[PDB]
Design a protein around this nucleic acid. Structure first.
Ligand SMILES: *P(=O)(O)OC[C@H]1O[C@@H](n2cnc3c(N)ncnc32)[C@H](O)[C@@H]1O
Length: 642
DNA sequence: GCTGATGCGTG
DNA sequence: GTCGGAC
DNA sequence: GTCCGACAACGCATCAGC
């Protein structure tokens, strides 16, 4: 209709044709997307964000259906389906260089402003490009921007960075109004709308339900909910939402789903897109549980099983009819080339009656000499891309815990009791290569407590807890965190807790813009009377506690570090702090660090020690830095892990 | 040919 | 990965 | 409970710079 600068997708009674800012068949302008992002970021209520995105999506369906897929990817800040592994190869480094060049400003000035504002988008938006001619280029389109992001991602090899920067600069030259803000945020990986995958799916199912695709233009049906009561409309949209969600969870690939949606409609979608070996599916996740009593409350009177939670990496293993094997990560990345050793062992793990399967396993580093699990850190030293089986140094043992598909049968809707029985009967254990997760079926609190203790003695993180028959399916769309995770470090007063000295602060980004988002912590090295950086810290405080930290630390800001504070390879703090505050910090584990100097030389000649999953517990007002946890005590904690 | 910075990705 | 905020 | 985005350590792969 008129200028996209006035586009209002949050408008009441939004009409997909009359309230759009482009004409039928025209390319969706990128400014329409940016204005939608603005209206989403302005609100706190997720369902209001969904309504606003739905409005844009309904206009796209009604007016410009070829742009639906790029608009969806822009809204997710994705480049394509996850198993294809497209990635920009752009972070703040390349982006800030491009912004500096685009605006003719010094890199260090742009970088400082980005830190201060806590958002690269605001820096890119408020500076004019020294390349822009008098007459600007034509307005950016949603599909055009998306294609340029993909162009950036496809550039590889020597001198590819300069080519990426040229594309980015070209985008900024053509930006108008709020566009540069969101192109910059997209490139930095921090769109930070408050709306992500689940809201995008809800907006999409609502949009195609209210404004059906494939109508002769002008569409006779622009709002198919209008003839329903609010109550009936709600039930209908919820049911349509679940159709899309369950399909996506089984086939998380918009390249596959959107063409079907536009051609056949949402009600027919599950006939055309179904779970199948070779296509990765969304894995079941776990909800953290802070005690066995919380477990029993959550699973009330539902029989459940406890399993060791192995400390490795998830491997979703697919065997297709015909013999091909694929392996995917928890995030649906294709890891087949990383595990030639697993591929060769598949004939050894499955009985010959098994013709196809999808297995849910943990890959764990395994010492064949000592016949014992090795730490996560050892597993991460595996090579990633096209490994050959002869060159493997770190062997892996698979710990299998679920079966999602068998001999052409999807088990998504089957109870774990049956899925587990099919797993145990149709696959073959080999010690140190493929074994079923150690498990316990019980409701006795004391057996569970002992099992949790035993899992930690047996090199695991704690327990997974899973119902066997009540709400015990693998339907991620119904509940994505259907399993519980119980770790010792969740229990109040249990686990590795340290008192550490605050030696630096980092300016916050995004939700933390305008205050500190993170802090640099140190342990006390008695031998050298130095404070040694041990880790950064960025979670565990409430918003109120974070404002209190900002107040209590402001007087401690130094221009230059104290001579007895050693940070070696740590990120230099934005504000150095006079060592004074002592905070209680909890972690899951201690790790040998390539950068942190804490306790260097006490366990390893070259490496100090850091904290895995550190979080703030409380301030120790009754401790001064000389009573903080010592670097010797840190070393003792690390050795005790064995 | 090598190294450190950068990016992606796992947890 | 942990965590807290908004719903 | 769900969803989201602040923030953690640290591995391999890649590429600019040398
Ligand atoms: P997040 O804290 O959601 O943890 C889930 C991951 O735990 C791993 N895992 C190890 N052992 C198990 C068992 N027995 N069952 C399920 N998941 C397990 C997986 O890698 C998960 O992704």
């Amino acid at each position: 209709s008129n200028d996209p600068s006035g586009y209002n997708p949050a408008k009441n009674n939004y009409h997909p044709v009359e309230d759009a800012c482009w004409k039928p068949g025209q390319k969706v302008p990128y400014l329409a997307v940016a204005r939608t992002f603005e209206k989403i970021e302005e609100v706190s209520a997720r369902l209001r964000m969904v309504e606003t995105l739905s409005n844009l999506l309904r206009s796209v369906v009604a007016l410009s259906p070829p742009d639906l897929l790029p608009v969806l990817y822009l809204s997710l800040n994705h480049l394509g389906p996850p198993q294809q592994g497209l990635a920009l190869g752009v972070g703040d480094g390349v982006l800030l260089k491009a912004v500096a060049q685009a605006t003719g400003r010094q890199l260090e000035s742009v970088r400082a402003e980005a830190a201060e504002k806590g958002d690269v988008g605001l820096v890119a938006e408020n500076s004019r490009s020294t390349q822009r001619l008098m007459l600007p280029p034509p307005p950016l389109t949603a599909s055009g921007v998306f294609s340029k992001f993909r162009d950036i991602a496809r550039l590889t090899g020597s001198a590819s960075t300069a080519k990426k920067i040229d594309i980015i600069k070209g985008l900024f030259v053509a930006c108008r109004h709020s566009e540069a803000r969101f192109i910059a945020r997209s490139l930095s990986g921090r769109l930070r709308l408050g709306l992500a995958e689940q809201s995008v799916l809800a907006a999409l199912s609502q949009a195609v339900s209210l404004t059906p695709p494939g109508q002769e233009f002008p569409p006779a049906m622009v709002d198919a909910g209008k003839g329903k009561t609010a109550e009936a409309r709600k039930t209908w949209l919820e049911e349509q939402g679940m159709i899309l969600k369950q399909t996506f969870c089984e086939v998380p690939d918009l390249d596959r789903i959107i063409p079907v949606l536009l051609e056949h409609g949402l009600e027919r979608l599950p006939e055309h897109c179904k779970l199948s070996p070779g296509i990765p599916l969304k894995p079941m996740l776990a909800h953290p549980t802070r005690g066995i009593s919380e477990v029993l409350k959550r699973f009330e009177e539902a029989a459940f099983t406890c399993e060791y939670k192995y400390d490795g990496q998830r491997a979703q293993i697919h065997a297709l009819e015909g013999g091909e094997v694929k392996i995917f990560s928890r995030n649906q990345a294709d890891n087949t080339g990383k595990y030639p050793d697993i591929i060769s062992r598949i004939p050894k793990i499955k009985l010959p009656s098994v013709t196809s399967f999808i297995l849910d396993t943990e890959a764990v580093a395994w010492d064949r000499e000592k016949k014992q699990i090795q730490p996560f850190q050892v597993l991460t030293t595996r090579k990633r891309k096209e490994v050959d089986a002869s060159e493997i140094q770190v062997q892996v043992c698979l710990y299998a815990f679920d079966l999602i598909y068998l001999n052409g049968e999807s088990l998504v809707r089957e109870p774990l009791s049956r899925r587990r029985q099919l797993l145990r009967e149709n696959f073959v254990e080999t010690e140190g290569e493929f074994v079923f997760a150690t498990s316990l079926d019980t409701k006795d609190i004391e057996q569970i407590a002992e099992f949790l203790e035993q899992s930690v003695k047996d090199s695991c993180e704690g327990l997974m807890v899973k119902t066997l028959d009540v709400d015990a399916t693998y339907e991620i769309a119904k509940r994505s965190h259907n399993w519980l995770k119980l770790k010792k470090d969740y229990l109040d007063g249990v686990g590795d807790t340290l008192d550490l000295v605050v030696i630096g602060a980092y300016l916050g980004r995004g939700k933390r813009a305008g205050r500190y988002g993170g802090f640099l912590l140190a342990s006390y090295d008695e031998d050298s009377e130095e404070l040694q950086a041990i880790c950064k810290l960025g979670t565990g405080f409430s918003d109120e506690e974070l404002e209190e930290h900002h107040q209590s630390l402001k007087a401690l800001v130094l221009p230059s570090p104290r001579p007895y504070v050693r940070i070696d390879g740590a990120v230099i703090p934005d504000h150095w702090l006079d060592p004074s505050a002592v905070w209680e910090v909890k972690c899951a584990d201690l790790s040998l660090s390539p950068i942190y100097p804490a306790a260097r030389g006490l366990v390893d000649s070259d490496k100090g020690i850091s904290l895995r999953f550190p979080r703030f517990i409380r301030v120790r007002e009754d401790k001064q830095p000389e009573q903080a946890t010592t670097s010797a005590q840190v070393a003792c904690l690390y050795r005790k892990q064995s």
